[PDB]
C-alpha cells in the first residue's frame, strides 16, 4: 500500500485514491498562509509573505490576471506563475475576441480543466500550488478556492497554507458581519487582517511581511505592499 | 479566395429612442436569376440582439450555424445564461468582427457584409456593422449594397446626428424604413417585395415581423411614357 502506488499520477491506489494528487497537496499546506474573503461589493485577498533570511526579500505571493481579476498562492510558486499566464491569456481572450470580461466562475472552470490533464496522464505532474481568485464581474463579487486535484468551490471566505484552519474557523464564525462590510473597503481589509493573524504564531505582521490585493465595484484589482499596508497593522 | 454565387442584396437598420430596427428583404439571387423567395436574412440571437447579413448565401448559412453554436456554448456550466451572462450584442458581433477580419487574413473571406442590431443590459443601442474586409463602422444609420447609396440618405433625413436618436420614435424610424424599402424595390435589380423587419426595444424587447410587402407603389405615370424622345403614340 502507499509504496507500490504514488510512482506516478496515472496510478490509482487500492483504496481509489491518487497519492501524487495528495504529495501535491501537501506542498500547499507547507505553504505560507493567505486569506481571502468578500462582500456584495468587494473581494479581499490578505497574504503572509515568507522569506529566506533577514537578508533575503518577502517572496510575493499575489498575482494580477486582469483589471477585474486576481489571485494569491500557497505552494510551488513557479507553478502559481504558469497558471496565472494561462488566466491571464484566459481573460485577455475573452476581452479581445468577445469584447467580455471573463465571468470569475468561468476563470474557476478554465483552472479545474488544466489541473485535471495533469493528474490522468504519463509523464506529467500535478500543479503543487493552491489558488485563492477574487474578482468582481457582472454578478458582483467573487472568491474561488483552487487546489490542484482539480476541485475549485465558490466561497464567502476562505485559507490556506500552514495553519490556515485558524483563520478559517475565525471567518466561518465572522461570516454574518463581514459579508455586510458593502461600500467600506478598509473595513473588509481589517476583517482579512484579523483573519489572518488568527494563524500567526512565529511571528507578528511587520511591513515588508503583509501583503494585501482589494477588487470590486468602483475598484480595479490593486496591490498593496509597504508602507501602504502600515495603516492595518 | 472565391466567388459569391446565392446572394442577399441591401441589409438597411436605424436606431431610435428606445430601441433599433433592421430590415431585410427575402431574396437569394443567382447571378441575374431571382432564385429563392423565401430566404430569411435576419438572423435573432436571443432576445436582444439581430444579425442582417448580405452577399454569399452559403456563407451566411455558416455564419448561421456559428451564431446558434455562441448560444449553446454560453450556456455551458453557466447558471446566468438568461441573466446577468446572456450574451450581448456587443460580444455576438465582436465575435463576428474577429472571425471576418481572420478570414480576410487568411486570404478566404466569409462574402458577406453584416449588420448587428440590438439593445445592451444597460438600455443602450447597439448598431455596428462588419464586412468580408472586417471592416467595422457604427453610425446612427446603417446599410450594405443599395442600401448604402439610396437607404442612408433617406434614413439620415431623419437621424442626421446623435441628438436626433432621442426625437425619434419607433413609429417615425419604422416608417421611414419602410419607405427605404420601397425605394430599393423600385431601383435595384436584385430586389424583391417581400421583406422582414425587426425591431428590438429597451422596453417591448424582439418584435420580428416576417411577409411584409412593398405597398402604395406609384406606377400610374408610366402609362404617359412614350418613346424615347421624338415619338408621340
Known amino acids: 500500500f502507499r509504496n507500490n502506488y504514488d510512482g506516478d499520477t496515472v496510478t490509482f491506489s487500492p483504496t481509489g485514491r491518487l497519492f501524487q494528487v495528495e504529495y501535491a497537496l501537501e506542498a500547499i499546506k507547507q505553504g505560507s498562509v493567505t486569506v481571502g474573503l468578500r462582500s456584495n461589493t468587494h473581494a479581499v485577498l490578505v497574504a503572509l509573505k515568507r522569506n529566506a533570511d533577514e537578508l533575503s526579500s518577502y517572496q510575493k505571493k499575489i498575482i494580477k490576471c486582469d483589471e477585474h481579476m486576481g489571485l494569491s498562492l500557497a505552494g510551488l510558486a513557479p507553478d502559481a506563475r504558469v497558471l496565472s499566464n494561462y488566466l491571464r491569456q484566459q481573460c485577455n481572450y475573452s476581452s479581445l475576441v468577445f469584447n467580455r470580461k471573463l465571468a470569475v466562475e468561468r476563470a474557476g472552470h478554465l483552472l479545474c480543466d488544466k489541473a485535471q490533464k495533469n493528474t490522468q496522464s504519463y509523464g506529467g505532474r500535478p500543479y503543487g500550488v493552491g489558488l485563492l481568485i477574487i474578482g468582481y464581474d457582472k454578478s458582483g463579487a467573487h472568491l474561488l478556492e483552487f487546489q490542484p486535484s482539480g476541485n475549485v468551490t465558490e466561497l464567502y471566505g476562505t485559507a490556506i497554507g500552514a495553519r490556515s484552519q485558524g483563520a478559517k474557523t475565525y471567518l466561518e464564525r465572522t461570516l454574518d458581519t463581514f459579508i455586510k462590510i458593502d461600500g467600506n473597503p478598509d473595513e473588509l481589509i481589517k476583517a482579512g487582517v484579523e483573519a489572518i493573524s488568527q494563524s500567526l504564531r512565529d511571528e507578528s505582521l511587520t511591513v515588508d511581511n503583509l501583503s494585501i490585493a482589494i477588487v470590486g465595484k468602483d475598484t480595479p484589482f490593486t496591490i498593496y505592499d509597504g508602507e501602504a499596508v502600515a495603516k492595518y497593522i | ?233
Open chain 2, 1 to 233: 479566395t472565391q466567388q459569391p454565387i446565392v446572394t442577399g442584396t441591401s441589409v438597411i437598420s436605424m436606431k431610435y429612442d428606445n430601441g433599433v430596427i433592421i430590415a431585410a428583404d427575402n431574396l437569394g439571387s443567382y447571378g441575374s436569376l431571382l432564385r429563392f423567395n423565401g430566404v430569411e436574412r435576419l438572423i435573432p440571437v436571443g432576445d436582444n440582439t439581430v444579425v442582417g447579413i448580405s452577399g454569399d448565401i452559403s456563407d451566411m448559412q455558416h455564419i448561421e450555424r456559428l451564431l446558434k453554436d455562441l448560444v449553446t456554448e454560453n450556456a455551458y456550466d453557466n447558471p446566468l445564461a438568461d441573466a446577468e451572462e446572456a450574451l450581448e450584442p456587443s460580444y455576438i458581433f465582436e465575435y463576428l468582427a474577429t472571425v471576418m477580419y481572420q478570414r480576410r487574413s487568411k486570404m478566404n473571406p466569409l462574402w458577406n457584409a453584416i449588420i448587428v442590431a440590438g439593445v445592451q443590459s444597460n438600455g443602450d443601442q447597439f448598431l455596428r456593422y462588419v464586412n468580408l474586409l472586417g471592416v467595422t463602422y457604427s453610425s446612427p444609420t446603417l446599410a450594405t449594397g443599395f442600401g448604402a447609396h439610396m437607404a442612408n440618405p433617406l434614413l439620415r433625413k431623419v437621424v442626421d446626428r446623435e441628438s436626433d436618436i432621442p426625437k425619434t420614435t419607433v413609429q417615425v424610424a419604422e416608417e421611414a424604413i419602410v419607405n427605404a424599402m420601397r425605394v430599393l424595390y423600385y431601383r435595384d435589380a436584385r430586389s424583391s417585395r417581400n421583406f422582414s423587419l425587426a425591431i428590438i426595444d429597451k422596453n417591448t424587447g424582439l418584435t420580428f415581423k416576417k411577409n411584409l410587402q412593398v405597398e402604395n407603389m406609384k406606377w400610374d405615370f408610366a402609362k404617359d411614357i412614350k418613346g424615347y424622345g421624338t415619338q408621340k403614340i
